[PDB]
């Protein structure tokens, strides 16, 4: 009941965050029952929107609905209430104000890049009754969350996949603008190169395998300290080769131990053998030869010569048994064949998939640092669109189009951003504000060249946070078809790339959508390479691949196709942030802390911010939260 509305909220239940105490001391630092009280009014609260965030949740509302003796205390009701309102944890996306906002706007905050990071922050300011205004280079907002929609075909290049519901704030988003979020089924056959499926014991087989050597790779980091090599940081690519290698090395010292083992039992036989052939000697000179007392002793030492040959004529047939089975018990001669390597590659390249960059890029220690604050429940995608987000947080918003920022200038006495029409150059436009928040890419924030420059230059802590990170890529074919003509229960299948450098060219498949769609994945080194393909060959490969599976007459010529190129795309540059070998978590949280010239004046959220939710959309609409919080405490 209560206690999972603050599950919901990512908070813990029976304790107060740093940040309550923070705002709290006379709670914290006051008797446990005044805490006890505090935490129940929050989690309340926290409940009260939840069962209906379509409708803004006021103070009044908040004690009407209260317990009974809770709501006595309205001093404590209304902190609460604020403090929640403030962060974005009770009154944020998109809902229904029952009190209109005021005419009179109490500061000007100019916001450049309209994605779900800057829609989030603007609402929230604009809730809190300040001017604000977005700049957004391209001609739709959303950003990352991009959809593309022609006829009956809806796909997203972007971003596609809630990643489970519990704790995360796009389930309120979901309620408020109706996403329709679907399930996807866990079952992915693999396909060799030549189009015959991989049998389940061998698809197993490496599946398995490819845990047990990322586990290695985890112990090597965190119980042996593997992490400096050589004055260089280790990368997971890295420790991955070195944690092979020694699994090939087991497979050889145990292929030599069986190889000893069987030329000791050869060289034992061979030396009965010559044993054997001495006592036949012996037995077929003693079968040549008182006299009748002579004959009795010869008789006598034969059937005693010719018993000594039994005893090891059972021996010979003992260790021959041995021998055989040696022979027909070795260890495997190699711990991967060619075909083993090219699906474990496979699985390398869904890694690769995952977090957008090449494993060799990976900083070993901490690129799953996030991994603690996953959210529970069944991953899904969006049939109605991803887009449908983004568009739905932008009604009712300042939003400039088509407007890029080139220059950002910030003092102690106000701010400045110029910004170019990109439909027509010579248009320039100036424009005035208070403060500014950046939630311009990573990919953006790295150009070598700049195309944004800031006047102050940023600082060198911002400026080797971001050239430390890393900031991946990731692209996507969509492929709409007029029937269906894959397996309806498979959302997923995979395409096993013939060479290690290639694997995740075109690995991975989604049949997901309900109407007649496929999304061909390319991941890894291969992403950055094939945005310099043509679509119509890149179509032509994935249609090569696909007619492999299934026969060529089966597969039509498609309707319609779309690729996107992330990484030349020029308001992206890349898909999402990568924990890079050099960087680590805290260099998020140093991407999100502000610059000052005195008070602060420009601001930073977006994607590459968030320490916990990093490269996902609710990392940005949190970190969009965040922002407004600080900005309305400074200028409030
Ligand atoms: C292929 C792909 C798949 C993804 N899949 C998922 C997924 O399944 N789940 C998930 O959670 N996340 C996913 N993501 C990541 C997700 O999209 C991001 O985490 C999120 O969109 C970040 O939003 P943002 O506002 O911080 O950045 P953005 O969405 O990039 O917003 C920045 C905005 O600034 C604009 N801009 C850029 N330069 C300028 C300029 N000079 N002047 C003005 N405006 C400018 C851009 O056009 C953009 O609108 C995916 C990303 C990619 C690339």
């Known amino acids: 009941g209560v206690e999972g509305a603050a599950f919901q909220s990512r908070l813990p239940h029976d304790r107060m965050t740093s940040q309550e105490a923070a705002?709290?001391?006379?709670?914290?630092?006051?008797?446990?029952?005044?805490?006890?009280?505090?935490?129940?009014?929050?989690?309340?609260?926290?409940?009260?929107?939840?069962?209906?965030?379509?409708?803004?949740?006021?103070?009044?509302?908040?004690?009407?609905?209260?317990?009974?003796?809770?709501?006595?205390?309205?001093?404590?009701?209304?902190?609460?209430?604020?403090?929640?309102?403030?962060?974005?944890?009770?009154?944020?996306?998109?809902?229904?104000?029952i009190k209109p906002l005021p005419t009179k706007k109490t500061g000007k905050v100019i916001i450049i890049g309209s994605g779900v990071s800057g829609l989030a922050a603007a609402r929230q300011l604009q809730s809190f009754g300040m001017d604000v205004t977005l700049l957004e280079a391209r001609d739709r907002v959303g950003g990352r969350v991009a959809t593309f929609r022609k006829g009956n075909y809806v796909a997203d290049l972007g971003a596609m996949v809630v990643t489970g519901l519990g704790g995360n704030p796009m389930a309120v988003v979901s309620k408020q603008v109706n996403m329709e979020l679907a399930k996807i089924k866990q079952k992915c056959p693999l396909y060799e190169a030549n189009g015959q499926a991989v049998p389940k014991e061998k698809d197993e087989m490496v599946e398995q395998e490819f845990n047990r050597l990322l586990e290695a790779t985890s112990y090597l980091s965190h119980q042996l300290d593997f992490n400096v090599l050589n004055n260089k940081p280790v990368s997971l690519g890295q420790a991955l080769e070195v944690v092979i290698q020694?699994?090939?090395?087991?497979?050889?010292?145990?292929?030599?131990?069986?190889?000893?083992?069987?030329?000791?039992?050869?060289?034992?036989?061979?030396?009965?053998?010559?044993?054997?052939?001495?006592?036949?000697?012996?037995?077929?000179?003693?079968?040549?030869?008182?006299?009748?007392?002579?004959?009795?002793?010869?008789?006598?030492?034969?059937?005693?010569?010719?018993?000594?040959?039994?005893?090891?004529?059972?021996?010979?047939?003992?260790?021959?048994?041995?021998?055989?089975?040696?022979?027909?018990?070795?260890?495997?001669?190699?711990?991967?064949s060619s075909r083993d390597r090219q699906i474990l590659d496979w699985h390398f390249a869904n890694l690769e998939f995952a977090n957008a960059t090449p494993l060799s890029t990976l900083s070993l220690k901490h690129w799953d640092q996030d991994d603690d604050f996953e959210f529970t429940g069944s991953h899904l995608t969006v049939r109605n669109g991803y887009s449908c987000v983004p568009v739905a947080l932008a009604e009712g918003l300042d939003i400039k189009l088509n407007t890029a920022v080139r220059q950002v200038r910030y003092t102690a006495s106000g701010c400045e951003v110029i910004a170019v029409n990109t439909r027509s150059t010579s248009q320039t436009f100036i424009y005035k504000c208070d403060a500014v928040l950046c939630t311009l890419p990573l990919g953006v924030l790295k150009q070598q060249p700049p195309a944004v420059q800031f006047v102050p230059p940023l600082p060198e802590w911002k400026t080797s946070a971001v050239q430390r990170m890393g900031f991946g890529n990731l692209n996507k074919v969509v492929l709409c078809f007029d029937r269906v003509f894959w397996d309806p229960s498979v959302n997923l299948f995979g395409h096993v790339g013939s060479t290690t450098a290639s694997r995740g060219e075109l690995f991975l498949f989604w049949n997901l959508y309900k109407a007649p769609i496929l999304l061909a994945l390319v991941a890894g080194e291969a992403a950055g390479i094939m945005e310099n393909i043509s679509d119509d060959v890149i179509v032509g490969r994935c249609l090569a691949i696909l007619k492999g599976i299934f026969g060529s007459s089966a597969v039509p010529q498609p309707k319609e196709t779309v690729v996107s190129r992330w990484r030349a795309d020029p308001w992206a540059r890349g898909s999402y942030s990568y924990v890079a070998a050099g960087s680590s978590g805290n260099d998020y949280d140093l991407m999100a802390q502000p610059i000052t010239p005195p008070i602060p004046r420009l601001f930073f959220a977006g994607e590459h911010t968030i320490r916990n939710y990093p490269a996902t959309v609710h990392g940005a609409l949190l970190s969009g939260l965040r922002e407004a919080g600080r900005i309305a405490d400074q200028f409030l």
């Open 246 to 336: 020694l699994q090939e090395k087991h497979v050889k010292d145990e292929q030599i131990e069986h190889w000893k083992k069987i030329v000791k039992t050869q060289e034992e036989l061979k030396e009965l053998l010559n044993k054997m052939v001495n006592l036949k000697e012996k037995i077929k000179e003693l079968h040549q030869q008182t006299a009748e007392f002579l004959v009795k002793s010869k008789h006598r030492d034969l059937t005693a010569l010719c018993k000594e040959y039994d005893e090891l004529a059972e021996t010979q047939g003992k260790l021959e048994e041995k021998l055989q089975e040696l022979e027909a018990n070795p260890p495997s001669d190699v711990y991967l």
């Open 23 to 97: 705002c709290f001391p006379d709670i914290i630092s006051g008797p446990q029952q005044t805490q006890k009280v505090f935490l129940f009014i929050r989690n309340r609260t926290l409940q009260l929107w939840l069962d209906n965030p379509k409708i803004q949740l006021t103070f009044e509302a908040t004690l009407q609905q209260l317990e009974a003796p809770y709501n006595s205390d309205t001093v404590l009701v209304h902190r609460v209430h604020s403090y929640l309102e403030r962060h974005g944890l009770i009154n944020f996306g998109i809902y229904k104000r």
